[PDB]
């Protein structure tokens, strides 16, 4: 039989595009305490958060 759609969606051309991602959201690795200002609260495509 043909390949089921579950295996067929595992191929990497079905993943979401990288251009929708605003950036990697990592906690900064800091030696000393870092003081930041929240500059903007933005929306990412797909992400409700």
């Amino acid at each position: 039989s043909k390949v089921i759609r579950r295996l067929r969606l595992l191929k990497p051309h079905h993943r979401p595009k990288a251009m929708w991602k605003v950036g990697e959201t990592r906690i900064p690795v800091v030696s000393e305490t870092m003081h930041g200002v929240v500059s903007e609260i933005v929306h990412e495509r797909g992400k409700v958060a």
């Binding site: 039989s1 089921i4 759609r5 579950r6 295996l7």
Partner: protein, 49 residues
């Protein structure tokens, strides 16, 4: 040809949809390592053990 559930003359599964976790990919369709099935009706404590 499309699916393990892909059936005939009446829309039914036909075999247990709880599949093993050691199943081949292409067989892992439906409830893939189901400890139980059916409506829960209970606390987390009564169902997990």
């Amino acid at each position: 040809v499309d699916h393990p559930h892909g059936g005939g003359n009446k829309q039914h599964i036909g075999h247990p949809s709880t599949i093993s976790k050691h199943a081949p990919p292409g067989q892992k369709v439906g409830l893939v390592a189901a400890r139980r099935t059916g409506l829960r009706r209970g606390s987390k404590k009564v169902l997990n053990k």
